[PDB]
Amino acid sequence: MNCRSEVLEVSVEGRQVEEAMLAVLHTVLLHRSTGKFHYAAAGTYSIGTVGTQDVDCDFIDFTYVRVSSEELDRALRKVVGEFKDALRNSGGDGLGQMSLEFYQKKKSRWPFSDECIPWEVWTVKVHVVALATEQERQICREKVGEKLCEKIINIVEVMNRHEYLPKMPTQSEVDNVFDTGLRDVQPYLYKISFQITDALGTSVTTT
Amino acid sequence: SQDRKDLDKFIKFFALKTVQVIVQARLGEKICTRSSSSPTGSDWFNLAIKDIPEVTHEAKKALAGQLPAVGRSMCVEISLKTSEGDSMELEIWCLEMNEKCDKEIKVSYTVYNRLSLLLKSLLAITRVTPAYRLSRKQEYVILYRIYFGEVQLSGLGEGFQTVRVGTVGTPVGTITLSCAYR
Secondary structure (H helix, E strand, O other): OOOOEEEEEEEEOOOOHHHHHHHHHHHHHHHOEEOOEEEOOOOOEEEOEEOEEEEEOOOOOOEEEEEOOHHHHHHHHHHHHHHHHHHHOOOOOOEEEEEEEEEEEEOOOOOOOOEEEEEEEEEEEEEEOOOOOHHHHHHHHHHHHHHHHHHHHHHHHHHHHOOOOOOOOOOOOHHHOEOOOOOOOEEEOEEEEEEEOOOOOOOOOOO | OHHHHHHHHHHHHHHHHHHHHHHHHOOOOOOEOOOEOOOOOOOHHHEOOOOOHHHHHHHHHHHOOOOOEOOEEEEEEEEEEOOOOOEEEEEEEEEEEOOOOOOOOOOOOHHHHHHHHHHHHHHHHOOOOHHHHHHHOOOOEEEEEEEEEOOOOHHHOOOOEEEEEEEEEEOOEEEEEEEEEO
Protein backbone atom coordinates (compact mmCIF):
# COMPACT_ATOMS: atom_id res chain seq x y z
CA MET A 1 0.00 0.00 0.00
CA ASN A 2 2.74 2.46 -0.97
CA CYS A 3 1.76 6.05 -1.64
CA ARG A 4 0.26 7.22 -4.94
CA SER A 5 0.77 10.85 -5.93
CA GLU A 6 -0.65 13.03 -8.71
CA VAL A 7 -0.09 16.63 -9.76
CA LEU A 8 -2.41 19.18 -11.37
CA GLU A 9 -1.60 22.68 -12.60
CA VAL A 10 -4.03 25.46 -13.52
CA SER A 11 -3.38 29.09 -14.46
CA VAL A 12 -6.21 31.23 -13.06
CA GLU A 13 -7.06 34.76 -12.06
CA GLY A 14 -6.90 35.63 -8.37
CA ARG A 15 -10.70 35.73 -8.24
CA GLN A 16 -10.95 32.21 -9.71
CA VAL A 17 -8.58 30.60 -7.21
CA GLU A 18 -11.29 29.48 -4.79
CA GLU A 19 -13.71 28.08 -7.37
CA ALA A 20 -10.91 26.25 -9.18
CA MET A 21 -9.76 24.50 -5.99
CA LEU A 22 -13.28 23.63 -4.82
CA ALA A 23 -13.96 21.99 -8.18
CA VAL A 24 -10.89 19.76 -7.82
CA LEU A 25 -11.40 18.92 -4.14
CA HIS A 26 -15.10 18.12 -4.50
CA THR A 27 -14.72 15.90 -7.56
CA VAL A 28 -11.96 13.93 -5.82
CA LEU A 29 -13.95 13.71 -2.59
CA LEU A 30 -16.98 12.61 -4.62
CA HIS A 31 -15.16 9.43 -5.64
CA ARG A 32 -13.38 9.10 -2.27
CA SER A 33 -16.49 8.84 -0.09
CA THR A 34 -19.46 6.59 0.62
CA GLY A 35 -22.70 6.65 2.54
CA LYS A 36 -22.58 6.69 6.31
CA PHE A 37 -22.25 3.23 7.83
CA HIS A 38 -24.82 2.34 10.49
CA TYR A 39 -23.53 -0.65 12.44
CA ALA A 40 -25.51 -3.45 14.07
CA ALA A 41 -24.44 -5.33 17.18
CA ALA A 42 -23.92 -8.48 15.10
CA GLY A 43 -21.32 -6.67 12.97
CA THR A 44 -23.37 -6.06 9.82
CA TYR A 45 -23.78 -2.49 8.63
CA SER A 46 -26.06 -0.56 6.30
CA ILE A 47 -24.74 2.07 3.89
CA GLY A 48 -26.51 5.41 3.65
CA THR A 49 -27.35 7.23 0.44
CA VAL A 50 -25.00 9.87 -0.93
CA GLY A 51 -26.59 12.90 -2.55
CA THR A 52 -25.17 14.94 -5.40
CA GLN A 53 -25.75 18.51 -6.54
CA ASP A 54 -24.38 20.78 -9.24
CA VAL A 55 -22.55 24.01 -8.49
CA ASP A 56 -22.33 26.70 -11.15
CA CYS A 57 -19.20 28.84 -11.08
CA ASP A 58 -19.46 32.62 -10.92
CA PHE A 59 -15.86 33.57 -11.78
CA ILE A 60 -15.47 30.66 -14.23
CA ASP A 61 -17.54 29.36 -17.15
CA PHE A 62 -17.74 25.93 -15.56
CA THR A 63 -20.02 23.65 -13.54
CA TYR A 64 -19.00 20.84 -11.22
CA VAL A 65 -20.71 18.10 -9.22
CA ARG A 66 -20.23 17.94 -5.47
CA VAL A 67 -21.73 15.79 -2.76
CA SER A 68 -24.69 17.46 -1.04
CA SER A 69 -22.99 17.48 2.39
CA GLU A 70 -23.02 21.07 3.67
CA GLU A 71 -20.58 20.46 6.53
CA LEU A 72 -18.01 19.21 4.01
CA ASP A 73 -18.68 22.22 1.77
CA ARG A 74 -18.14 24.75 4.56
CA ALA A 75 -15.11 22.79 5.79
CA LEU A 76 -13.49 22.90 2.35
CA ARG A 77 -14.33 26.55 1.70
CA LYS A 78 -12.65 27.43 5.00
CA VAL A 79 -9.26 25.90 4.18
CA VAL A 80 -9.34 27.11 0.59
CA GLY A 81 -10.07 30.47 2.19
CA GLU A 82 -6.83 30.14 4.16
CA PHE A 83 -5.07 29.41 0.86
CA LYS A 84 -6.65 32.46 -0.79
CA ASP A 85 -5.49 34.65 2.12
CA ALA A 86 -1.92 33.30 2.28
CA LEU A 87 -1.34 33.72 -1.46
CA ARG A 88 -2.55 37.34 -1.45
CA ASN A 89 -0.30 38.13 1.49
CA SER A 90 2.61 36.40 -0.28
CA GLY A 91 2.57 38.95 -3.07
CA GLY A 92 4.87 38.81 -6.05
CA ASP A 93 5.53 35.08 -5.82
CA GLY A 94 1.93 34.03 -6.41
CA LEU A 95 2.92 30.35 -6.80
CA GLY A 96 1.04 28.22 -4.27
CA GLN A 97 -0.36 24.72 -4.09
CA MET A 98 -2.72 22.62 -1.98
CA SER A 99 -2.40 18.92 -1.16
CA LEU A 100 -5.25 16.48 -0.43
CA GLU A 101 -3.94 13.38 1.35
CA PHE A 102 -5.94 10.20 1.96
CA TYR A 103 -4.47 8.18 4.81
CA GLN A 104 -5.10 5.09 6.92
CA LYS A 105 -4.66 5.02 10.71
CA LYS A 106 -2.49 2.24 12.14
CA LYS A 107 -2.40 1.31 15.82
CA SER A 108 0.93 1.57 17.63
CA ARG A 109 2.04 0.04 20.91
CA TRP A 110 2.58 2.29 23.92
CA PRO A 111 4.02 4.89 24.15
CA PHE A 112 3.87 5.55 20.40
CA SER A 113 0.84 7.19 18.83
CA ASP A 114 -1.10 5.86 15.85
CA GLU A 115 0.83 6.19 12.59
CA CYS A 116 -1.01 7.75 9.64
CA ILE A 117 0.08 5.92 6.49
CA PRO A 118 -0.82 7.82 3.28
CA TRP A 119 -2.23 5.77 0.41
CA GLU A 120 -3.16 8.56 -2.06
CA VAL A 121 -2.24 12.25 -2.30
CA TRP A 122 -3.47 14.97 -4.68
CA THR A 123 -1.45 18.13 -5.33
CA VAL A 124 -2.86 21.11 -7.24
CA LYS A 125 -0.38 23.83 -8.19
CA VAL A 126 -1.81 27.33 -8.70
CA HIS A 127 -0.37 29.95 -11.07
CA VAL A 128 -2.01 33.34 -10.57
CA VAL A 129 -2.06 35.76 -13.52
CA ALA A 130 -2.69 39.49 -13.15
CA LEU A 131 -5.32 41.13 -15.35
CA ALA A 132 -6.10 44.63 -16.60
CA THR A 133 -8.86 45.03 -19.14
CA GLU A 134 -12.34 43.55 -18.90
CA GLN A 135 -12.33 41.84 -22.30
CA GLU A 136 -9.36 39.82 -21.05
CA ARG A 137 -11.51 38.84 -18.06
CA GLN A 138 -14.41 37.57 -20.18
CA ILE A 139 -11.96 35.36 -22.12
CA CYS A 140 -10.10 34.15 -19.03
CA ARG A 141 -13.44 32.88 -17.72
CA GLU A 142 -14.04 30.71 -20.81
CA LYS A 143 -10.51 29.35 -21.19
CA VAL A 144 -10.19 28.63 -17.46
CA GLY A 145 -13.46 26.68 -17.61
CA GLU A 146 -12.25 24.69 -20.61
CA LYS A 147 -9.01 23.87 -18.79
CA LEU A 148 -10.90 22.68 -15.71
CA CYS A 149 -12.82 20.34 -18.02
CA GLU A 150 -9.54 18.65 -19.01
CA LYS A 151 -8.55 18.54 -15.33
CA ILE A 152 -11.77 16.86 -14.17
CA ILE A 153 -11.62 14.39 -17.06
CA ASN A 154 -8.05 13.49 -16.09
CA ILE A 155 -9.06 13.01 -12.45
CA VAL A 156 -11.85 10.63 -13.47
CA GLU A 157 -9.49 8.77 -15.82
CA VAL A 158 -7.11 8.33 -12.87
CA MET A 159 -9.78 7.14 -10.37
CA ASN A 160 -9.80 3.94 -12.48
CA ARG A 161 -6.07 3.31 -13.00
CA HIS A 162 -5.79 3.22 -9.18
CA GLU A 163 -6.90 -0.28 -8.19
CA TYR A 164 -5.88 -0.19 -4.52
CA LEU A 165 -8.15 1.05 -1.74
CA PRO A 166 -8.12 0.16 1.97
CA LYS A 167 -10.27 -2.77 3.03
CA MET A 168 -13.72 -2.14 4.46
CA PRO A 169 -13.35 -1.92 8.26
CA THR A 170 -15.24 -3.58 11.08
CA GLN A 171 -17.24 -1.63 13.64
CA SER A 172 -14.27 -1.00 15.93
CA GLU A 173 -11.68 0.29 13.45
CA VAL A 174 -14.07 2.34 11.29
CA ASP A 175 -12.21 5.52 12.32
CA ASN A 176 -8.90 4.10 11.08
CA VAL A 177 -10.14 4.57 7.49
CA PHE A 178 -13.15 6.90 7.35
CA ASP A 179 -14.00 10.36 8.66
CA THR A 180 -17.25 9.55 10.48
CA GLY A 181 -17.71 13.10 11.77
CA LEU A 182 -20.06 14.36 9.05
CA ARG A 183 -23.77 13.57 9.29
CA ASP A 184 -24.32 13.54 5.53
CA VAL A 185 -21.30 11.61 4.18
CA GLN A 186 -18.58 9.16 5.18
CA PRO A 187 -15.46 10.25 3.28
CA TYR A 188 -12.11 8.55 3.58
CA LEU A 189 -9.74 9.90 6.22
CA TYR A 190 -8.31 13.00 4.54
CA LYS A 191 -5.92 15.80 5.44
CA ILE A 192 -5.74 19.05 3.48
CA SER A 193 -2.61 21.21 3.75
CA PHE A 194 -1.17 23.85 1.43
CA GLN A 195 2.19 25.44 0.71
CA ILE A 196 3.46 28.57 -1.04
CA THR A 197 6.31 27.78 -3.44
CA ASP A 198 9.42 29.70 -4.48
CA ALA A 199 9.75 29.59 -8.26
CA LEU A 200 12.74 27.68 -9.63
CA GLY A 201 14.56 27.99 -12.93
CA THR A 202 14.65 25.65 -15.91
CA SER A 203 17.85 23.81 -16.79
CA VAL A 204 19.32 24.09 -20.29
CA THR A 205 19.51 20.42 -21.29
CA THR A 206 17.53 19.04 -24.26
CA THR A 207 16.83 22.68 -25.24
CA SER B 1 -26.55 -19.41 -9.60
CA GLN B 2 -28.15 -16.65 -7.53
CA ASP B 3 -24.86 -14.73 -7.62
CA ARG B 4 -25.09 -14.02 -11.35
CA LYS B 5 -28.82 -13.31 -11.04
CA ASP B 6 -27.98 -10.54 -8.57
CA LEU B 7 -25.23 -9.54 -11.00
CA ASP B 8 -27.91 -9.25 -13.69
CA LYS B 9 -29.89 -7.01 -11.33
CA PHE B 10 -26.82 -4.82 -10.85
CA ILE B 11 -26.08 -4.53 -14.57
CA LYS B 12 -29.73 -3.80 -15.39
CA PHE B 13 -30.19 -1.04 -12.83
CA PHE B 14 -26.73 0.34 -13.57
CA ALA B 15 -27.79 0.74 -17.21
CA LEU B 16 -31.09 2.37 -16.23
CA LYS B 17 -29.30 4.77 -13.87
CA THR B 18 -26.76 5.50 -16.61
CA VAL B 19 -29.56 6.66 -18.91
CA GLN B 20 -31.00 8.65 -15.99
CA VAL B 21 -27.74 10.49 -15.28
CA ILE B 22 -27.09 11.30 -18.94
CA VAL B 23 -30.59 12.47 -19.89
CA GLN B 24 -30.90 14.44 -16.65
CA ALA B 25 -27.53 16.06 -17.38
CA ARG B 26 -28.97 17.15 -20.75
CA LEU B 27 -32.23 18.34 -19.15
CA GLY B 28 -31.37 22.04 -19.18
CA GLU B 29 -31.21 22.83 -15.46
CA LYS B 30 -29.26 21.89 -12.34
CA ILE B 31 -29.89 18.57 -10.59
CA CYS B 32 -29.97 18.39 -6.79
CA THR B 33 -30.59 15.34 -4.62
CA ARG B 34 -30.44 15.21 -0.82
CA SER B 35 -28.62 12.52 1.14
CA SER B 36 -30.22 10.22 3.70
CA SER B 37 -28.85 8.15 6.57
CA SER B 38 -32.13 6.18 6.72
CA PRO B 39 -32.44 5.38 3.00
CA THR B 40 -35.08 3.56 0.97
CA GLY B 41 -34.91 0.23 -0.84
CA SER B 42 -34.85 2.25 -4.08
CA ASP B 43 -31.53 4.13 -3.67
CA TRP B 44 -29.50 2.03 -6.08
CA PHE B 45 -25.71 2.07 -5.70
CA ASN B 46 -26.04 4.27 -2.59
CA LEU B 47 -26.86 7.17 -4.92
CA ALA B 48 -29.93 9.41 -4.93
CA ILE B 49 -30.82 9.43 -8.63
CA LYS B 50 -34.54 10.11 -9.00
CA ASP B 51 -35.88 8.08 -11.91
CA ILE B 52 -38.05 10.08 -14.31
CA PRO B 53 -40.64 7.59 -15.60
CA GLU B 54 -40.67 8.63 -19.27
CA VAL B 55 -36.97 7.90 -19.75
CA THR B 56 -37.09 4.65 -17.78
CA HIS B 57 -39.88 3.59 -20.14
CA GLU B 58 -37.91 4.63 -23.23
CA ALA B 59 -34.78 2.94 -21.83
CA LYS B 60 -36.62 -0.32 -21.14
CA LYS B 61 -38.19 -0.33 -24.60
CA ALA B 62 -34.68 0.10 -26.01
CA LEU B 63 -33.35 -2.75 -23.85
CA ALA B 64 -36.36 -4.98 -24.68
CA GLY B 65 -35.63 -6.89 -21.48
CA GLN B 66 -31.99 -7.59 -22.34
CA LEU B 67 -28.56 -6.65 -20.99
CA PRO B 68 -25.36 -5.52 -22.73
CA ALA B 69 -22.94 -8.23 -23.82
CA VAL B 70 -20.25 -8.95 -26.41
CA GLY B 71 -21.34 -7.26 -29.63
CA ARG B 72 -24.51 -5.96 -27.93
CA SER B 73 -23.97 -2.52 -26.40
CA MET B 74 -26.36 0.16 -25.14
CA CYS B 75 -26.02 3.67 -26.56
CA VAL B 76 -27.51 7.03 -25.56
CA GLU B 77 -27.53 9.51 -28.45
CA ILE B 78 -27.71 13.20 -27.50
CA SER B 79 -28.62 15.34 -30.50
CA LEU B 80 -29.78 18.86 -31.37
CA LYS B 81 -32.68 20.29 -33.34
CA THR B 82 -32.73 23.97 -34.37
CA SER B 83 -35.37 26.15 -36.03
CA GLU B 84 -34.17 25.18 -39.51
CA GLY B 85 -34.34 21.47 -38.66
CA ASP B 86 -30.65 20.56 -38.84
CA SER B 87 -30.08 17.38 -36.83
CA MET B 88 -26.60 16.80 -35.39
CA GLU B 89 -25.36 13.88 -33.31
CA LEU B 90 -23.51 15.67 -30.51
CA GLU B 91 -22.81 12.77 -28.16
CA ILE B 92 -22.98 8.99 -28.24
CA TRP B 93 -22.56 7.55 -24.76
CA CYS B 94 -21.57 3.89 -25.12
CA LEU B 95 -22.02 1.17 -22.48
CA GLU B 96 -19.91 -1.72 -23.80
CA MET B 97 -19.44 -5.20 -22.33
CA ASN B 98 -16.30 -6.95 -23.58
CA GLU B 99 -15.27 -10.61 -23.41
CA LYS B 100 -12.50 -10.60 -20.78
CA CYS B 101 -13.97 -11.92 -17.54
CA ASP B 102 -12.28 -11.84 -14.13
CA LYS B 103 -12.93 -14.62 -11.61
CA GLU B 104 -10.91 -12.97 -8.82
CA ILE B 105 -13.95 -10.85 -7.85
CA LYS B 106 -16.56 -11.79 -5.30
CA VAL B 107 -19.42 -10.42 -7.41
CA SER B 108 -21.25 -10.11 -4.09
CA TYR B 109 -20.51 -6.44 -3.42
CA THR B 110 -17.22 -5.34 -5.01
CA VAL B 111 -18.88 -4.99 -8.42
CA TYR B 112 -21.74 -3.09 -6.77
CA ASN B 113 -19.45 -0.51 -5.15
CA ARG B 114 -17.19 -0.08 -8.18
CA LEU B 115 -20.32 0.38 -10.32
CA SER B 116 -21.37 3.05 -7.81
CA LEU B 117 -18.08 4.86 -8.37
CA LEU B 118 -18.59 4.45 -12.12
CA LEU B 119 -21.94 6.23 -11.78
CA LYS B 120 -20.19 8.99 -9.82
CA SER B 121 -17.59 9.35 -12.57
CA LEU B 122 -20.47 9.53 -15.05
CA LEU B 123 -22.07 12.27 -12.95
CA ALA B 124 -18.86 14.32 -13.03
CA ILE B 125 -18.03 13.68 -16.70
CA THR B 126 -21.53 14.54 -17.98
CA ARG B 127 -20.86 18.16 -16.93
CA VAL B 128 -17.49 18.70 -18.66
CA THR B 129 -18.46 17.82 -22.23
CA PRO B 130 -19.34 20.78 -24.51
CA ALA B 131 -22.88 19.48 -24.98
CA TYR B 132 -23.53 20.25 -21.31
CA ARG B 133 -22.68 23.94 -21.66
CA LEU B 134 -24.86 23.82 -24.78
CA SER B 135 -27.83 22.09 -23.14
CA ARG B 136 -27.83 24.45 -20.14
CA LYS B 137 -28.52 27.46 -22.42
CA GLN B 138 -31.48 26.02 -24.32
CA GLU B 139 -33.36 28.63 -29.97
CA TYR B 140 -32.01 25.10 -29.54
CA VAL B 141 -33.69 21.91 -28.39
CA ILE B 142 -31.96 18.74 -27.16
CA LEU B 143 -33.12 15.22 -28.03
CA TYR B 144 -32.14 11.80 -26.69
CA ARG B 145 -32.55 8.30 -28.06
CA ILE B 146 -31.54 4.99 -26.45
CA TYR B 147 -30.79 2.08 -28.77
CA PHE B 148 -29.24 -1.39 -28.56
CA GLY B 149 -26.28 -1.70 -30.93
CA GLU B 150 -24.09 -2.29 -32.93
CA VAL B 151 -22.55 1.10 -32.14
CA GLN B 152 -21.39 3.41 -34.92
CA LEU B 153 -20.34 7.05 -34.87
CA SER B 154 -20.30 8.01 -38.57
CA GLY B 155 -22.92 10.69 -37.82
CA LEU B 156 -20.42 12.49 -35.58
CA GLY B 157 -18.41 13.96 -38.47
CA GLU B 158 -14.67 13.49 -38.90
CA GLY B 159 -12.47 14.47 -35.97
CA PHE B 160 -14.56 13.40 -32.99
CA GLN B 161 -12.88 12.69 -29.66
CA THR B 162 -13.73 10.08 -27.04
CA VAL B 163 -13.66 10.46 -23.26
CA ARG B 164 -13.57 7.27 -21.17
CA VAL B 165 -15.59 7.53 -17.98
CA GLY B 166 -14.41 4.14 -16.77
CA THR B 167 -14.42 0.35 -16.66
CA VAL B 168 -15.58 -2.24 -14.10
CA GLY B 169 -14.53 -5.90 -14.26
CA THR B 170 -17.13 -8.61 -13.62
CA PRO B 171 -17.07 -12.43 -13.78
CA VAL B 172 -19.19 -12.13 -16.96
CA GLY B 173 -16.82 -9.55 -18.49
CA THR B 174 -15.69 -5.99 -18.02
CA ILE B 175 -18.07 -3.06 -18.45
CA THR B 176 -16.86 0.05 -20.27
CA LEU B 177 -18.63 3.41 -20.22
CA SER B 178 -17.38 6.12 -22.57
CA CYS B 179 -18.61 8.99 -24.72
CA ALA B 180 -17.94 10.00 -28.33
CA TYR B 181 -18.64 13.71 -28.76
CA ARG B 182 -18.29 16.20 -31.60
